[PDB]
Amino acid sequence: SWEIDPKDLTFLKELGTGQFGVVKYGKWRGQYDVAIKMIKEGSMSEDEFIEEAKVMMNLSHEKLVQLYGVCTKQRPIFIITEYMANGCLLNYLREMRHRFQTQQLLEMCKDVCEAMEYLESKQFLHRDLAARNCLVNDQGVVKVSDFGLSRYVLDDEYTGSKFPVRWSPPEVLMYSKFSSKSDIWAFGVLMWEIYSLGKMPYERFTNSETAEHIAQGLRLYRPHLASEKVYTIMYSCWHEKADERPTFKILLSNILDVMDEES
Numbered sequence: 531s532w533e534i535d536p537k538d539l540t541f542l543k544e545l546g547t548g549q550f551g552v553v554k555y556g557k558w559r560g561q562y563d564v565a566i567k568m569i570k571e572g573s574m575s576e577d578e579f580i581e582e583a584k585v586m587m588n589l590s591h592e593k594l595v596q597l598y599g600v601c602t603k604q605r606p607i608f609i610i611t612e613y614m615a616n617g618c619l620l621n622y623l624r625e626m627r628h629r630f631q632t633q634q635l636l637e638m639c640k641d642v643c644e645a646m647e648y649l650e651s652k653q654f655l656h657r658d659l660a661a662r663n664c665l666v667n668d669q670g671v672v673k674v675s676d677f678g679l680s681r682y683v684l685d686d687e688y689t690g691s692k693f694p695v696r697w698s699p700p701e702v703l704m705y706s707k708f709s710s711k712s713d714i715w716a717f718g719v720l721m722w723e724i725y726s727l728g729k730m731p732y733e734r735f736t737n738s739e740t741a742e743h744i745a746q747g748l749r750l751y752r753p754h755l756a757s758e759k760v761y762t763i764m765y766s767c768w769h770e771k772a773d774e775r776p777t778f779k780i781l782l783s784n785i786l787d788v789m790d791e792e793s
């Protein structure tokens with residue numbers, strides 16, 4: 531049931547290449563749009579990932595990119611997903627032509643927060659939430675992607691020269707303490723990225739420097755497009771004590787309240 535027959539796929543366009551490799555746009559059974567992520571040989575702990583895919587296929591939320599199945603009886607293995615025509619959120623935010631309104635940016639945060647509240651409800655950690663992981667569909671809806679996938683990456687630079695230092699709380703950087711509250715911290719950084727139109731967090735600093743900054747209790751500061759009420763929500767994600775950070779349920783309530791006040 532987790533297995534797609536790759537003979538049912540037609541390849542139409544190259545979408546680009548990440549750490550597992552090439553992603554293509556195509557159709558399933560001649561008609562339905564899909565994305566096809568091809569997992570480069572040596573890149574993944576594939577038997578672990580296949581077992582996890584069974585769980586991932588039962589996750590279902592409107593703001594979570596849907597995993598349709600996998601193709602594992604050849605290599606490279608394929609992950610078949612919902613097609614997100616507007617591509618990765620980070621590049622979408624950096625296109626200045628969009629001329630976003632702040633109501634649109636707030637909606638992007640709300641989309642992600644809904645997805646994360648749903649993952650929170652299923653005790654499923656993202657583990658690498660960031661704008662580079664989120665996707666945007668043809669209607670401008672942002673959805674969370676690549677959820678949990680970092681667990682199966684075999685390149686140790688990621689697991690590190692390529693680790694997501696700029697999206698990690700103090701306890702992760704100091705002790706490798708992952709939790710729901712590390713996803714919360716990352717979500718605040720993602721809200722910062724959205725309101726900053728895709729600026730790299732701590733843009734003047736190296737990763738090493740960033741980790742020192744955070745150790746000394748310093749923080750990102752208010753994007754020009756964020757109101758004080760929006761800044762309060764993102765900043766709440768960065769409490770030094772993990773247990774004092776909000777849940778995604780609380781964050782969602784905070785976001786809806788601001789939407790209502792900023793209407």
Ligand SMILES: *CCC(=O)N1CCC[C@@H](n2nc(-c3ccc(Oc4ccccc4)cc3)c3c(N)ncnc32)C1
Pocket residue numbers: 545546547548553565566567595596597609610611612613614615616617618619620621665675676677679
């Ligand atoms: C930033 C440029 C860009 O738009 N990118 C990066 C290059 C590929 C492109 N893209 N990737 C996917 C996609 C992501 C993740 C999965 O698999 C997955 C695994 C675990 C959990 C959820 C999903 C498959 C495909 C794209 C999709 N779906 N649509 C369009 N472009 C996609 C994004």
